[PDB]
Design a protein around this nucleic acid. Structure first.
Length: 165
DNA sequence: CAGCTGAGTCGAC
DNA sequence: CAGCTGAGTCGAC
DNA sequence: CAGCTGAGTCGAC
């Protein structure tokens, strides 16, 4: 039943996350962490402090797909275990220094062809697949996008819901 | 001294 | 059975 | 997050 997913998404804020490669998204799924560029990092830290849930919807550049979505469980933190990100040309470790903890809600993929009917009113009513890293998605649009994902049987939402209450 | 730059897709060609 | 698909840049948005 | 960018002359063409 979608009621427990809908619970997590109530009053949430939604952000498109773009990755230059697949490897860092697979690493994010294995380790439950994410790092982003500094302007987006500050925006996510601010959203985490005020929003009931901050939802990151992942899409690898030029893949034509979303690869899943996750909920922020902490602000970004520096120091400790350095994440062995695969750095594309022009990307540095210091560029991505802050590490967010995230809890995956769905790790299954959704191709753009199945979201062709969803438009984001916070991006000129363009299709939700249109956007740069950190593009905010309006509440209703982001909710419907997350509900389009097939259910992920490898996900138990207990830990997420427990830390929310 | 401060702002930019470094994780957009699409169609034409 | 045979053809396609898998190593284009650019500007609009 | 850090480095760059924003007060060179000259000769070939």
């Amino acid at each position: 039943g979608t009621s427990k997913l809908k619970y997590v998404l109530q009053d949430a804020r939604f952000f498109l996350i773009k990755s230059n490669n697949h490897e860092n998204v697979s690493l994010a799924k294995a380790k439950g962490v994410w790092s982003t560029l500094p302007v987006n990092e500050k925006k996510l830290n601010l959203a985490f402090r005020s929003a009931r849930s901050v939802i990151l919807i992942f899409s690898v550049r030029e893949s034509g797909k979303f690869q899943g979505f996750a909920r922020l469980s902490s602000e970004s933190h520096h120091g400790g275990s350095p994440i062995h990100w695969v750095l594309p040309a022009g990307m540095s470790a210091k560029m991505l220094g802050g590490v967010f903890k995230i809890d995956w809600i769905c790790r299954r993929e959704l191709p753009f062809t199945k979201s062709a009917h969803l438009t984001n009113p916070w991006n000129e009513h363009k299709p939700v697949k249109i956007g740069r890293d950190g593009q905010e998605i309006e509440l209703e649009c982001g909710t419907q996008l997350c509900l389009l994902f097939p259910p992920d049987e490898s996900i138990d939402l207990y830990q997420v819901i427990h830390k929310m209450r």
